[model samples]
Target: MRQPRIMEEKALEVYDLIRTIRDPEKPNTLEELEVVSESCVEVQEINEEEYLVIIRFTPTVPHCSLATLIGLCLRVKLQRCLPFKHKLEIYISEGTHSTEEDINKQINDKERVAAAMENPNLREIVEQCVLEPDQLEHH
Candidate 1:
């Protein structure tokens, strides 16, 4: 009703928000690693009062240890940057990981995610993952 951008525009916009998040264990952005892509995001307007955002990210390997961290990065960034009322569902793409379901549970739970950030070390790591590229890249 208000923003026609809900169709696919917001999906593309959401992609841009997390595209530059650095991989927790790598030196490249999520986009560079193909961990996340424009096609993986979907947005829908709900009840004219909120939007629904669904993101499905893939891991570089089936056993990638940082998949959960990547999910956390996406959750944190979208929660902070998206300029509208919305619901977010972050997932590891189907069959992309051996333990994706478990990770999804952890990332989607408000209490669990909050507990993770409550740990000083985990907070530091998430902060690093979500930092804008210019802040850490010297070259």
Candidate 2:
């Protein structure tokens, strides 16, 4: 569900950025994590000219540990790429994870997100998470 028309390319940019993110088990991309067939970003008009982008995805396991890192990477990637005015939302495909709701809430919280990004420990995790799998051949 979205507005009559959306910023399709903007969403595609986010998808392309995220589609290359890989971890050990899912070496291709977030969209290739097995549970997710295809993934994309959504640019929806919330009101007036205000737009919202929902980064919707699926998870292979109910309590996948890397889910938080993946969500954080997406949030950070959007923060880096998107215009500051547009709203951003992150969500797991319905019933995709046991803690999806909680994970969504935490990642969407501006305060918590900022605080976590400031922590050196968290920063390390995020840096690794955002790298291409091939890049991590050195890690």
Candidate 3:
């Protein structure tokens, strides 16, 4: 199918925006890691008021924990940087055997975790199970 004209323009803007967001855990930006593929970025109208954004990323490892973080970062970036409100779906590359259901679940859980952390009582409860010997685990 031919790409919508608006999407083509937004795609270019997305590319530029992502290039400016450096990966927090690495020296490279998302664009430099080739995380944002040509086929990965797309903008589509979901309804009159919202757009749907599809973003794909390559995990540092096959079973990386950073997947959800990366997804959330993309979502936030899009929400804050884009001119319009959009519903975002961040998926791993198709060849990676990733499924939309799995990614959605991760995103939901990540949001839940963030919300829990915002509550002092809930954060303490969750932290009890999360404390570990690893330095990075503390952050």
Candidate 4:
């Protein structure tokens, strides 16, 4: 599919926005940890009034517990950073265990849940997840 040209200015802005989100399961920003792959984001116009953002996540392990949370974080971060009306879809890659339906549902619900949380509380939660060497465990 031919993708819309994401404005260079907007693309850089989006990259910066996504980079600010620290990975809860890793010791770096989602961008730094490389968990949020480049292929994960595809910005497109869904219709006349809405833009669509497709975000994908690579699990720490096939059965990682934070897969959904990472996706949720991305969705919320984009919503807060983008000004236009948009629909965010977070999906695990084809080989992963998570189904597209589940990912979509979680992304929508989590965005709502995250939005309801006060900004300070949300910031505290994300900050607590920032990179910590001791937090890494090989299971």
Off by over 4 Å in 3: 1-6, 47-49, 93-104, 108-139
The sequence of per-residue lDDT tens digits that candidate 1 reaches over residues 1-139 is 5846455888888999999988888878888898877888998888677888898778766653576778888998898888779788888754444577788876778887888789888789889889867765576
Error (Å) of candidate 2 at residue 19 is: 1.0
Assess the local accuracy of residue 22 in candidate 4 as a C-alpha lDDT between 0 and 100: 70
Give Cα-based local distance difference scores for all models. 0.80, 0.67, 0.56, 0.59
lDDT of 2 by residue, 1-139 (tens): 8648667776776677767666534556666674332345677667766778787666555553566666777777677666656787877644454577877766778887797689888777777767766654644
Clashing pairs in 1: none
TM for every model, in the order presented, reads 0.84, 0.71, 0.61, 0.61
Clashing pairs in 3: none
lDDT of 4 by residue, 1-139 (tens): 9965554454455556676567665556666777765555666666677776766667554443365556667666777668878776666643255564564565467644465345665555544643223444666
Q: Write out the backbone clash pairs for model 4.
A: 27-131
Which tens-of-lDDT digit does each residue in 1-139 have in candidate 3?
8954467667767656555454435644566566666666777776677777776666544443455445555655665567757666666643246564465565445564465357676444323322222333443
What TM-score would candidate 4 get against the native? 0.61
TM-score winner:
1
Taking the candidates one at a time, how many backbone clashes does each contain?
0, 0, 0, 1
